[PDB]
Amino acid sequence: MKSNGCRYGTHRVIEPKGVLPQPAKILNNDMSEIWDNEMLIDVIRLNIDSASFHQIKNKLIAQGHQDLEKAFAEHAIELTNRTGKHKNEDTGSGGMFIGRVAAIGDKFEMKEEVKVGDKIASLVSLSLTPLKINKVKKVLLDKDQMEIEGQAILFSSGVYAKLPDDLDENLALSVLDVAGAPAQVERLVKPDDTVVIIGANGKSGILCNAVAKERAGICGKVIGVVRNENYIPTCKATGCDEVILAQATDAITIQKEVSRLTNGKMADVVINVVNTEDTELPSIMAAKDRGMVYFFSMATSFTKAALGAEGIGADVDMMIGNGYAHHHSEIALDLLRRNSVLMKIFKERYA
Amino acid sequence: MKSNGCRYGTHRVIEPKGVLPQPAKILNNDMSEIWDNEMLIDVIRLNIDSASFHQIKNKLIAQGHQDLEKAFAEHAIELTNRTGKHKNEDTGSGGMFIGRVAAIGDKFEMKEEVKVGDKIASLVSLSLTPLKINKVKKVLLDKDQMEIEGQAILFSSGVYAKLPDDLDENLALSVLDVAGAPAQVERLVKPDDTVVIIGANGKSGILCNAVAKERAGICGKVIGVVRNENYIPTCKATGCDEVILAQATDAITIQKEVSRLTNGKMADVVINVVNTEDTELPSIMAAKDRGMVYFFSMATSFTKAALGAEGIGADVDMMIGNGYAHHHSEIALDLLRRNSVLMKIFKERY
Ligand SMILES: [Cl-]
Ligand SMILES: [Cl-]
C-alpha cells in the first residue's frame, strides 16, 4: 500500500508530467501495489468504444494482418503495456470494463457500496483507467468486445456501478447508458409542474416520462414530443399525460402545441433527450419565463443554446445534462423495479 | 399596420418557409408597413461582428478591390437587399446596431420603456434582424463599424437597451456587451458563499468580481483566477478577497489552490468568464460537491463539459450561461454608477 493518493489519479501519470490521467499519454499500470484511495478490479471483459474498435481493426487489415483476432489481441496487449491504458492513440477514445472487485483501499471514497468479489461495471472511460492485460481469452469483432484476464484501477474520483443479481448483465448495462437522466430529472421537477420531454419515446425519454410524472404528481402535466403517432401509446403508458406530434427541430409547432396544451402558460421544465442537432431553440421556446431547460443529449451545441435564448429574449435556465449523479445507478434500477410497465418495455427493447 | 404578428418574427421569413428568422436565409426587410408587435428603428450605425467583419474584409481583400471602403459598402447593400438582413453567408455571425426609434407597434411587447425618437442599442444579432440599408455614409475598417442611413425591425421577442444620457455612448455600449454577466451573478451567489471567478481581470470578469462580493457578503469568499500577476491589483480592487495565479487550462493547480484557500471545502459557485478553450474541467474541479458551475464564455464545449464531469465523478450543476436576463441592461449600468472603481476601469479600458 502507498499513502496519499490523489483522488484524480495524478500519482499514476508518467508522461507528460503535471497533467491529468485522461489527456496523459503514459500511465502507471503497475498492479503489484495500489494506493490507499484506489480500488482494484479483476477485469474479465473490455467493451471498447465502437469508433475506436473500428479504427484499430481497419488499421490492422491495411498493414496487413490475417487473423484479426490475434492481431487485435496483440495490439491491445502492446498498447496497454506501453501506454498503461487502452486509449486510442489516433482518436483518444477508450471504453469501459466489466470485472470483479479485487481490493479496496482503506481510504477509498466509496460511492455505491461494494465489497471484494462484487461484480461491477466501469462508468469512466478507459482513456483514464490504468489497465493491465495479462491474457486475451477471446476477441469478439462483432461486439467491440474483449474477454480478457487483467486488472484495472478505479480512482476515488471514478464512477462505477455494482451489477445487480436480479437482472442480466447486458440488460443492466442498458440502464446505465442513460442512468444520469432520471437521477437529474427528479431534482428539477417539483409537484404540479408542467414538463415537456422532447424525445419521450427514446431510451432515456421513457425513463424521464416516468420520473417526471412521479415528481409532478397527480396534478402535474407531462407532455411528450415525438415524431410518429405510433409512439403515443408508449409515451402515455410511461407517464406522459399529453403527447405532441412534431419534429424535434420544429420550434414553431412545438411552441404552439405546448401553448395550446397549457393555455399559454408553457412548461416549467423542458427535458431534451432526442440526440438530434438543432433542437436547442425548440426546447428553449417551449419553456415559460424563468423555466428550466435540461439538455441531456451530446448533440447539444453550447453556442446554439446560449445565442438561441439571446436572440429571442428567453430568460430561461439551461442545464448541461450529465451522465453521472449521486446514486444514479441505484436510482435508475429502482425506478425499473417499481414500474412493471417501464421494466417490460426496457427488457423487450434493450435486453 | 398589419395584425397578428409573430412575436418570434416568422411572419417575415421568406425562404425557407417554416423556420425562424435567424436560421432563415431570406428575410422580408420591407419597411413601408410594420406588424402590430414590431418596433421600427432608424439605424445610425452598424456594429458588425468582428469575425464577420474581418472575414468579409479579407474576402474583399482577397478578391482584388482597391477601394476597400467602397467594396465593403457595396457588399453590405447587396447582402441586405437580397437576403433582407446582414447575416454573414459564410459564417453565421451578424452584429448589433445603434439607432433611434421610428415607430412602435400598438401591441409591441415592451421590455425597457422607450418612445419614438429615443436612442437605443440592439442586443439581438443582425443575423435575425430585418435590415434595409439606404445609404452607407462611411465604413470604419479598424472598428468593424458602418455609419449608415437605414431601418431595422425589432420583434417583440427581441432585446434592446435605451442608451443613457448621463454616460458616454461607447461607455454604455461597453457595458451592454457583457450586461448579462452581473444580472446572472446576483442570482447565483448566496450570502457566505465561496465564489471562484476564472478570468477575473477580463471585461465581464471585473463585473462578476464586484457582484459576487456584494452578494456573498462580508463573510463570503471571492477568489479570482488569472494567468498574469499584474492582474492581481485589479482583481482585489474589484471584489476578489483572494487571487490564484494559474493558467485557466491548468485544472490541477486551480484545484489545489482553491482547496488551500478554502481548507478543502471548495467553491459554492464557479463562474467561467475566460474565452479560452479547455477550461471546462478546471471549472468543474474547483466546485464543491453539488456546487454550481456557470459557463459564460462561447469557448465552452458542451461535450467537454459533460464528459469532463463524468470522468472525475463530479455531481455538479453545470449551466449554459445566458447573456440575457430581466433588466440586465439597467442592472449592469446601475452597477457602474454605484461602483466608482468599476467606472474608472471601464472608462480607461473601454
Ligand atoms: Cl405551472
Ligand atoms: Cl491540467
XYZ file of C-alpha atoms and ligand atoms in Angstrom:
703
model
C 0.000 0.000 0.000
C 1.113 3.550 -0.831
C -0.189 6.593 1.027
C -1.543 9.995 -0.025
C -3.020 9.019 -3.372
C -4.553 11.766 -5.481
C -8.297 11.278 -5.904
C -7.954 12.412 -9.531
C -5.146 9.926 -10.203
C -2.200 12.251 -10.853
C 0.039 9.892 -8.849
C -0.033 7.432 -11.781
C 0.710 9.973 -14.537
C 4.110 9.208 -16.079
C 4.132 11.185 -19.334
C 3.564 14.026 -19.691
C 4.238 15.248 -16.149
C 1.794 17.579 -14.426
C -1.302 16.514 -16.385
C -4.462 14.544 -15.598
C -4.713 10.801 -16.362
C -7.108 11.077 -19.321
C -5.126 13.532 -21.522
C -1.863 11.910 -20.399
C -0.098 9.540 -22.775
C 1.576 7.070 -20.381
C 0.041 5.904 -17.100
C 1.496 3.684 -14.385
C -0.398 0.386 -14.701
C 1.574 -1.486 -12.029
C -0.905 -3.697 -10.160
C 1.508 -5.256 -7.650
C 0.715 -2.404 -5.238
C -2.181 0.053 -5.083
C -2.570 3.395 -3.347
C -4.670 3.921 -0.232
C -7.604 5.535 -2.088
C -7.762 3.255 -5.146
C -9.944 0.242 -5.903
C -8.502 -2.748 -7.766
C -10.738 -4.635 -10.209
C -10.222 -8.054 -11.807
C -11.192 -7.239 -15.389
C -12.979 -10.036 -17.233
C -14.340 -8.065 -20.211
C -13.423 -4.908 -22.130
C -16.127 -3.029 -24.054
C -14.021 -0.871 -26.363
C -15.588 2.255 -27.850
C -17.191 1.439 -31.193
C -15.365 4.163 -33.130
C -12.040 3.189 -31.548
C -12.561 -0.531 -32.204
C -13.282 0.128 -35.887
C -10.232 2.380 -36.271
C -7.917 -0.211 -34.709
C -9.350 -3.054 -36.794
C -9.162 -1.171 -40.102
C -5.616 -0.093 -39.224
C -4.645 -3.760 -38.845
C -6.167 -5.017 -42.109
C -4.243 -2.323 -44.026
C -0.862 -3.263 -42.502
C -1.993 -6.014 -43.012
C -2.798 -8.898 -40.693
C -4.520 -12.197 -41.459
C -6.115 -13.350 -38.193
C -7.630 -10.099 -36.931
C -8.446 -11.579 -33.515
C -4.773 -12.398 -32.954
C -3.620 -9.024 -34.298
C -6.158 -7.107 -32.204
C -5.278 -9.085 -29.069
C -1.564 -8.396 -29.521
C -2.337 -4.762 -30.368
C -4.278 -4.346 -27.117
C -1.544 -6.049 -25.079
C 1.219 -3.946 -26.640
C -0.769 -0.725 -26.206
C -1.744 -1.312 -22.572
C 1.772 -2.468 -21.673
C 3.375 0.578 -23.325
C 0.857 3.337 -22.515
C -0.614 1.870 -19.316
C -4.172 2.169 -20.660
C -6.350 1.363 -23.665
C -6.565 4.897 -25.035
C -6.652 5.083 -28.829
C -3.507 6.933 -29.893
C -5.173 8.304 -33.055
C -8.620 9.333 -31.767
C -8.366 9.327 -27.970
C -11.416 7.272 -27.046
C -11.441 4.272 -24.733
C -14.457 2.417 -23.386
C -15.481 0.673 -20.186
C -14.712 -2.623 -18.474
C -16.608 -5.347 -16.631
C -14.996 -7.152 -13.733
C -14.973 -8.176 -10.093
C -13.635 -6.167 -7.163
C -10.227 -7.452 -6.046
C -9.050 -4.979 -3.390
C -10.478 -1.827 -1.803
C -8.058 0.670 -0.314
C -8.833 1.791 3.217
C -9.061 5.452 2.152
C -11.093 4.718 -0.993
C -14.017 7.115 -1.470
C -16.866 4.616 -1.711
C -19.773 5.657 -3.924
C -22.038 2.638 -4.314
C -21.388 0.100 -1.567
C -19.260 -2.751 -2.935
C -17.075 -5.401 -1.315
C -14.325 -7.672 -2.606
C -15.765 -10.136 -5.106
C -18.651 -7.925 -6.226
C -19.265 -7.678 -9.970
C -19.097 -4.036 -11.062
C -19.231 -2.066 -14.308
C -16.876 0.787 -15.139
C -18.581 4.135 -15.727
C -15.480 6.175 -16.613
C -13.664 5.951 -19.926
C -10.769 3.558 -20.488
C -8.792 6.643 -21.586
C -8.046 7.349 -17.901
C -8.127 3.888 -16.278
C -4.731 2.251 -15.626
C -5.156 -1.141 -17.271
C -3.002 -4.278 -17.317
C -3.888 -7.101 -19.716
C -2.349 -10.440 -18.748
C -4.181 -12.636 -21.275
C -6.751 -12.080 -24.027
C -9.083 -15.074 -23.869
C -11.255 -14.006 -26.817
C -11.646 -11.096 -29.239
C -15.225 -10.503 -30.431
C -15.046 -8.290 -33.520
C -18.840 -8.347 -33.983
C -19.250 -6.948 -30.444
C -16.357 -4.455 -29.999
C -15.535 -6.736 -27.086
C -12.535 -8.447 -25.490
C -12.832 -11.282 -22.964
C -9.539 -10.915 -21.094
C -7.686 -11.678 -17.875
C -6.449 -8.474 -16.302
C -6.755 -5.765 -13.687
C -7.774 -2.101 -13.745
C -7.565 0.819 -11.316
C -10.520 2.976 -10.293
C -9.504 6.236 -8.648
C -11.519 7.723 -5.796
C -12.966 10.188 -8.329
C -14.019 7.409 -10.706
C -17.577 6.189 -11.192
C -18.731 2.569 -11.107
C -21.925 0.553 -10.757
C -22.494 -2.750 -8.989
C -24.232 -5.135 -11.376
C -27.375 -6.477 -9.662
C -28.224 -10.136 -9.173
C -31.885 -9.782 -10.220
C -31.086 -8.551 -13.756
C -28.914 -9.919 -16.534
C -25.653 -8.178 -17.384
C -26.353 -6.600 -20.777
C -29.796 -5.520 -19.562
C -28.239 -3.832 -16.527
C -25.759 -2.140 -18.871
C -28.688 -0.778 -20.893
C -29.998 1.291 -17.984
C -26.534 2.649 -17.079
C -26.212 4.206 -20.549
C -28.892 6.727 -19.528
C -28.893 6.406 -15.737
C -27.898 10.053 -15.281
C -31.082 11.380 -16.885
C -33.667 10.150 -14.316
C -31.352 10.944 -11.394
C -31.016 14.563 -12.542
C -34.591 14.961 -13.812
C -36.130 14.117 -10.427
C -34.207 17.063 -8.945
C -35.666 19.590 -11.406
C -39.358 18.602 -11.371
C -41.469 19.967 -8.488
C -45.073 18.973 -7.693
C -47.718 20.357 -10.092
C -45.026 21.201 -12.661
C -45.728 21.082 -16.385
C -42.903 19.119 -18.022
C -42.175 18.854 -21.752
C -39.981 15.929 -22.820
C -38.598 16.174 -26.356
C -37.861 12.561 -27.282
C -40.259 10.893 -24.860
C -40.240 7.601 -26.803
C -36.457 7.207 -26.625
C -34.263 5.159 -24.319
C -33.774 7.891 -21.710
C -37.087 9.511 -22.654
C -39.279 6.737 -21.263
C -37.277 6.873 -18.027
C -37.808 10.640 -17.900
C -41.505 10.130 -18.692
C -41.939 8.043 -15.539
C -39.757 10.230 -13.311
C -41.432 13.449 -14.465
C -44.883 12.051 -13.666
C -43.791 10.782 -10.242
C -42.409 14.211 -9.331
C -45.067 16.385 -10.983
C -47.818 14.356 -9.321
C -51.490 13.778 -9.989
C -51.990 17.490 -10.727
C -48.884 17.934 -12.872
C -48.830 17.704 -16.657
C -46.193 15.671 -18.510
C -46.157 16.432 -22.247
C -44.170 14.252 -24.624
C -42.915 15.335 -28.044
C -42.461 12.590 -30.645
C -42.189 12.292 -34.422
C -44.600 9.418 -35.138
C -48.171 8.846 -33.977
C -47.417 5.192 -33.179
C -45.081 6.341 -30.379
C -48.007 7.897 -28.476
C -49.206 4.727 -26.646
C -45.703 4.138 -25.265
C -45.406 7.749 -24.087
C -48.711 7.672 -22.193
C -48.009 4.232 -20.706
C -44.662 5.553 -19.417
C -46.085 8.664 -17.752
C -46.936 11.304 -20.351
C -50.329 12.946 -19.899
C -50.219 14.545 -23.364
C -48.178 13.834 -26.496
C -47.248 16.358 -29.198
C -46.632 15.138 -32.757
C -43.868 17.260 -34.293
C -40.286 17.116 -35.491
C -37.769 17.807 -32.731
C -36.318 20.612 -34.889
C -39.738 22.249 -35.467
C -39.587 25.114 -32.980
C -42.804 26.822 -34.098
C -45.047 23.746 -33.975
C -43.682 22.638 -30.592
C -44.169 26.156 -29.214
C -47.749 26.482 -30.467
C -48.701 22.956 -29.388
C -47.224 23.461 -25.917
C -49.107 26.773 -25.867
C -52.441 25.145 -26.734
C -51.961 22.350 -24.184
C -51.016 24.783 -21.386
C -53.269 27.796 -22.148
C -50.179 29.877 -22.871
C -48.568 29.026 -19.522
C -45.876 26.845 -21.179
C -43.649 24.333 -19.375
C -41.846 24.701 -16.058
C -39.223 22.109 -17.073
C -38.084 21.165 -20.586
C -36.168 17.886 -20.918
C -34.301 17.296 -24.190
C -33.300 13.683 -24.873
C -33.649 13.407 -28.656
C -29.925 13.362 -29.539
C -30.761 15.447 -32.608
C -28.930 18.563 -33.739
C -30.668 21.958 -33.849
C -33.154 21.158 -31.070
C -31.917 23.807 -28.611
C -34.239 26.591 -29.775
C -37.359 24.333 -29.820
C -36.535 23.333 -26.238
C -35.951 26.942 -25.158
C -39.157 28.286 -26.719
C -41.229 25.571 -25.008
C -40.316 26.793 -21.514
C -42.152 29.509 -19.626
C -40.425 32.636 -18.354
C -37.673 31.621 -15.901
C -38.165 27.976 -16.852
C -35.594 25.190 -16.753
C -34.190 23.545 -19.895
C -32.350 20.239 -19.408
C -30.038 19.207 -22.276
C -29.088 15.552 -21.791
C -28.012 14.767 -25.363
C -24.424 15.083 -26.585
C -25.789 16.613 -29.812
C -26.355 19.906 -27.959
C -24.285 22.904 -29.054
C -23.316 25.256 -26.228
C -23.146 28.126 -28.726
C -26.530 27.448 -30.346
C -28.289 27.262 -26.969
C -26.718 30.390 -25.466
C -27.092 32.521 -28.599
C -30.520 30.990 -29.203
C -32.049 32.202 -25.942
C -30.419 35.605 -26.502
C -31.883 36.323 -29.941
C -35.432 35.665 -28.709
C -35.059 37.165 -25.226
C -35.766 33.952 -23.313
C -34.748 34.345 -19.660
C -34.520 30.601 -19.068
C -32.070 28.413 -17.180
C -30.215 25.897 -19.348
C -28.520 22.829 -17.861
C -25.627 20.853 -19.318
C -27.096 17.433 -18.586
C -24.550 14.990 -17.206
C -24.173 11.228 -17.275
C -23.356 10.991 -13.559
C -25.197 11.936 -10.386
C -25.313 10.669 -6.816
C -26.553 7.060 -6.685
C -27.747 7.385 -10.288
C -27.340 3.659 -10.985
C -29.321 2.570 -7.920
C -31.989 5.194 -8.649
C -32.443 4.097 -12.269
C -32.561 0.414 -11.307
C -35.038 1.170 -8.515
C -37.273 3.004 -10.994
C -37.461 -0.085 -13.211
C -38.216 -2.382 -10.265
C -41.132 -0.187 -9.150
C -42.666 0.285 -12.631
C -43.549 -3.036 -14.261
C -44.767 -1.328 -17.445
C -41.450 0.522 -17.656
C -39.462 -2.635 -16.888
C -41.334 -4.618 -19.544
C -40.534 -2.100 -22.292
C -36.878 -1.865 -21.255
C -36.341 -5.633 -21.363
C -38.082 -6.014 -24.732
C -36.153 -3.159 -26.395
C -32.678 -3.133 -24.789
C -32.058 -6.662 -23.468
C -50.230 48.306 -39.627
C -50.585 44.555 -40.147
C -52.196 42.402 -37.467
C -51.278 39.105 -35.788
C -47.511 39.470 -35.935
C -45.490 36.552 -34.622
C -43.505 37.531 -31.534
C -40.592 35.418 -32.807
C -40.771 37.103 -36.218
C -41.678 34.216 -38.531
C -44.110 36.448 -40.460
C -41.073 37.985 -42.217
C -39.392 34.678 -43.137
C -39.332 34.241 -46.922
C -37.063 31.251 -47.549
C -37.256 28.573 -46.447
C -40.918 28.673 -45.385
C -41.190 27.332 -41.847
C -38.042 28.368 -39.978
C -37.203 31.153 -37.544
C -35.663 34.455 -38.719
C -32.125 33.624 -37.558
C -31.673 30.252 -39.356
C -33.689 31.613 -42.289
C -31.688 32.704 -45.324
C -34.025 35.350 -46.806
C -35.975 37.779 -44.619
C -38.615 40.324 -45.608
C -36.896 43.662 -44.953
C -39.733 45.841 -46.253
C -40.161 48.902 -44.038
C -43.183 50.653 -45.584
C -45.519 48.813 -43.186
C -44.807 47.055 -39.891
C -46.714 44.482 -37.882
C -48.627 45.305 -34.711
C -45.979 43.780 -32.405
C -42.836 45.154 -34.084
C -40.724 48.230 -33.383
C -39.211 50.299 -36.198
C -35.726 51.759 -35.691
C -33.917 54.445 -37.687
C -30.453 52.880 -37.821
C -27.468 55.174 -37.284
C -24.602 52.682 -37.023
C -23.991 49.002 -37.762
C -21.541 47.296 -35.386
C -20.744 44.140 -37.348
C -19.398 41.106 -35.505
C -15.604 41.239 -35.573
C -15.169 37.765 -37.070
C -17.831 38.512 -39.689
C -16.383 41.944 -40.494
C -12.818 40.636 -40.782
C -13.957 37.649 -42.852
C -15.849 39.904 -45.268
C -12.976 42.407 -45.296
C -10.400 39.698 -46.015
C -12.668 38.202 -48.688
C -12.787 41.566 -50.465
C -9.034 41.993 -49.980
C -8.632 38.507 -51.486
C -10.881 39.436 -54.429
C -8.803 42.363 -55.701
C -10.617 45.512 -54.594
C -8.593 48.728 -54.459
C -11.191 50.860 -52.625
C -11.961 48.624 -49.651
C -14.435 51.015 -48.010
C -16.333 51.142 -51.303
C -16.217 47.360 -51.746
C -17.440 46.709 -48.200
C -20.215 49.296 -48.561
C -21.437 47.677 -51.782
C -21.138 44.243 -50.160
C -23.409 45.258 -47.278
C -26.007 46.881 -49.545
C -26.050 43.874 -51.882
C -26.245 41.417 -48.977
C -29.116 43.201 -47.222
C -31.116 43.900 -50.391
C -31.034 40.222 -51.414
C -31.318 38.461 -48.037
C -33.115 41.148 -46.015
C -30.503 41.067 -43.237
C -26.772 41.357 -42.607
C -26.144 37.704 -41.813
C -22.731 36.503 -42.962
C -23.339 33.986 -45.738
C -20.152 32.004 -44.974
C -20.112 32.061 -41.168
C -23.251 32.702 -39.112
C -22.306 35.955 -37.423
C -24.213 39.226 -37.553
C -23.793 42.017 -35.020
C -25.860 44.752 -33.397
C -26.980 48.257 -34.338
C -27.471 51.717 -32.851
C -30.425 53.868 -33.797
C -33.395 55.995 -32.831
C -36.943 54.682 -32.522
C -39.063 55.490 -35.581
C -42.353 53.689 -34.864
C -43.723 51.398 -32.145
C -46.425 48.859 -32.900
C -49.510 49.025 -30.707
C -49.118 45.501 -29.292
C -45.317 45.562 -29.087
C -44.157 43.647 -26.016
C -42.297 46.478 -24.300
C -39.293 45.462 -22.219
C -37.259 48.598 -21.465
C -39.540 51.630 -21.722
C -38.739 53.646 -24.861
C -40.629 56.156 -27.000
C -40.342 57.469 -30.549
C -37.034 59.262 -31.018
C -35.271 57.504 -28.142
C -31.698 56.354 -28.732
C -31.477 52.573 -28.318
C -28.970 49.761 -28.804
C -29.872 46.388 -30.279
C -28.995 43.379 -28.131
C -30.078 40.758 -30.685
C -27.926 39.583 -33.565
C -28.187 41.148 -37.010
C -28.452 37.577 -38.347
C -32.135 37.660 -37.336
C -32.825 41.402 -37.692
C -34.646 42.536 -40.856
C -32.480 45.372 -42.140
C -32.769 47.801 -45.058
C -29.702 49.913 -45.867
C -30.495 53.017 -47.916
C -27.010 54.577 -47.788
C -23.630 53.754 -46.241
C -22.101 57.010 -45.017
C -18.739 55.518 -44.019
C -17.052 52.157 -43.430
C -14.622 52.063 -40.485
C -12.378 49.073 -41.200
C -10.485 49.431 -37.908
C -13.722 49.478 -35.869
C -15.920 46.883 -37.657
C -18.487 49.683 -37.947
C -20.723 51.183 -40.622
C -22.373 54.581 -40.244
C -25.446 54.237 -42.456
C -28.914 55.567 -43.193
C -31.344 52.691 -42.860
C -34.024 50.966 -40.832
C -34.312 47.733 -38.858
C -37.111 45.658 -37.333
C -37.122 44.592 -33.681
C -39.562 41.792 -32.915
C -41.483 41.541 -29.654
C -39.087 38.748 -28.648
C -36.102 40.986 -29.398
C -33.818 42.593 -26.835
C -32.723 46.231 -26.748
C -31.353 48.837 -24.353
C -32.096 52.552 -24.108
C -28.777 54.385 -24.208
C -28.486 56.625 -21.125
C -27.987 60.376 -21.357
C -25.627 60.533 -18.354
C -22.903 58.350 -19.902
C -20.662 58.323 -22.952
C -22.257 56.276 -25.726
C -19.336 53.877 -26.133
C -19.095 53.863 -22.343
C -22.592 52.378 -22.089
C -22.161 50.077 -25.097
C -19.072 48.537 -23.493
C -21.316 47.603 -20.558
C -24.168 46.203 -22.669
C -21.679 43.865 -24.374
C -21.461 41.959 -21.063
C -24.708 43.153 -19.461
C -25.858 39.586 -18.770
C -22.872 38.863 -16.522
C -23.822 40.921 -13.415
C -27.527 40.073 -13.712
C -26.919 36.319 -13.554
C -24.218 36.517 -10.868
C -26.538 38.229 -8.382
C -28.902 35.272 -8.881
C -26.259 32.569 -8.361
C -24.387 33.810 -5.270
C -25.909 33.419 -1.793
C -24.592 35.078 1.384
C -21.444 33.436 2.822
C -20.774 31.675 -0.498
C -17.297 30.903 -1.790
C -17.138 32.098 -5.405
C -14.392 31.253 -7.905
C -14.213 33.509 -10.968
C -11.931 32.216 -13.729
C -10.905 35.274 -15.729
C -11.381 37.893 -13.031
C -9.438 40.550 -14.984
C -11.484 40.483 -18.197
C -14.309 42.789 -19.200
C -17.091 40.649 -17.732
C -14.761 39.263 -15.060
C -14.409 42.502 -13.106
C -18.199 42.900 -13.132
C -18.545 39.370 -11.756
C -16.000 40.127 -9.019
C -17.982 43.082 -7.665
C -21.432 41.483 -7.806
C -20.131 38.239 -6.301
C -18.629 40.157 -3.377
C -21.749 42.172 -2.537
C -23.944 39.067 -2.781
C -21.551 36.747 -0.925
C -21.182 39.405 1.755
C -18.704 40.215 4.485
C -18.382 36.522 5.404
C -18.178 35.231 1.834
C -15.016 34.462 -0.114
C -14.460 35.664 -3.687
C -11.446 34.039 -5.363
C -10.138 35.218 -8.725
C -8.112 33.157 -11.195
C -5.771 34.923 -13.634
C -2.718 33.970 -15.670
C -0.683 37.146 -15.066
C 0.486 38.530 -11.719
C -0.147 42.079 -12.950
C -3.917 41.476 -12.895
C -3.958 40.965 -9.104
C -4.495 44.623 -8.037
C -7.435 44.925 -10.437
C -8.915 41.648 -9.172
C -8.703 42.620 -5.498
C -9.867 46.188 -6.159
C -12.975 44.853 -7.935
C -14.058 42.454 -5.188
C -11.764 39.428 -5.017
C -10.668 38.510 -1.499
C -8.031 36.104 -2.855
C -6.397 35.684 -6.268
C -4.924 32.462 -7.682
C -2.122 32.579 -10.252
C -2.575 29.765 -12.764
C -3.331 29.151 -16.408
C -7.074 28.798 -16.942
C -6.437 25.388 -18.550
C -4.469 24.103 -15.520
C -7.093 22.071 -13.672
C -4.675 20.580 -11.130
C -3.208 23.898 -9.960
C -6.619 25.576 -9.664
C -7.989 22.645 -7.652
C -5.036 22.553 -5.249
C -5.020 26.332 -4.782
C -8.795 26.582 -4.321
C -8.511 23.733 -1.810
C -5.735 25.550 0.061
C -7.713 28.811 0.151
C -10.898 27.025 1.304
C -9.396 24.358 3.621
C -10.704 21.688 1.252
C -14.285 22.999 1.298
C -14.017 24.249 -2.325
C -16.285 26.789 -4.030
C -20.067 27.010 -3.864
C -20.172 28.791 -7.244
C -17.668 28.693 -10.113
C -18.023 31.375 -12.797
C -16.096 30.847 -16.041
C -15.584 34.077 -17.989
C -12.385 33.162 -19.835
C -12.874 32.956 -23.600
C -10.314 30.147 -23.521
C -10.836 26.566 -24.665
C -10.377 23.507 -22.432
C -11.343 25.343 -19.237
C -14.425 23.208 -18.531
C -12.625 20.671 -16.338
C -10.663 23.346 -14.389
C -14.030 24.966 -13.650
C -15.619 21.647 -12.647
C -12.857 20.538 -10.271
C -12.949 23.885 -8.434
C -16.581 23.363 -7.401
C -17.646 21.567 -4.245
C -19.998 18.593 -4.256
C -23.396 19.692 -5.614
C -21.809 23.050 -6.421
C -22.672 25.449 -9.223
C -20.629 25.906 -12.410
C -21.737 28.768 -14.680
C -20.159 28.752 -18.153
C -20.452 32.227 -19.683
C -17.860 32.108 -22.472
C -18.593 30.925 -26.008
C -15.395 28.835 -25.998
C -17.171 26.298 -23.768
C -17.696 22.864 -25.316
C -20.869 21.059 -24.249
C -19.298 17.612 -24.655
C -16.070 18.579 -22.874
C -18.219 19.854 -20.006
C -20.442 16.758 -19.976
C -17.621 14.221 -20.315
C -15.396 16.262 -18.002
C -17.695 15.886 -15.002
C -18.307 12.199 -15.770
C -14.669 11.104 -15.803
C -13.971 12.601 -12.367
C -17.376 11.879 -10.808
C -18.360 15.479 -10.079
C -22.062 15.744 -9.223
C -22.119 19.451 -10.045
C -24.739 21.668 -11.657
C -23.412 22.977 -14.983
C -25.299 25.821 -16.662
C -25.159 27.242 -20.178
C -24.572 30.909 -19.362
C -27.347 33.122 -20.716
C -26.316 36.555 -21.969
C -29.897 37.780 -21.488
C -31.828 38.263 -18.259
C -34.580 40.502 -16.935
C -33.396 44.123 -16.705
C -29.761 43.130 -17.297
C -29.003 46.397 -19.117
C -30.405 48.589 -16.334
C -28.817 46.361 -13.679
C -25.381 46.487 -15.320
C -25.427 50.237 -15.987
C -26.552 50.921 -12.413
C -23.635 48.893 -11.036
C -21.207 51.147 -12.914
C -22.883 54.183 -11.336
C -22.690 52.637 -7.854
C -19.086 51.413 -8.244
C -16.620 54.225 -8.927
C -13.757 51.706 -9.109
C -15.554 49.828 -11.886
C -16.491 53.060 -13.678
C -12.857 54.196 -13.702
C -11.653 50.860 -15.093
C -14.396 50.694 -17.731
C -13.710 54.276 -18.835
C -9.958 53.689 -19.126
C -10.066 50.327 -20.937
C -13.334 50.505 -22.901
Cl -47.341 25.521 -13.630
Cl -4.313 20.102 -16.365
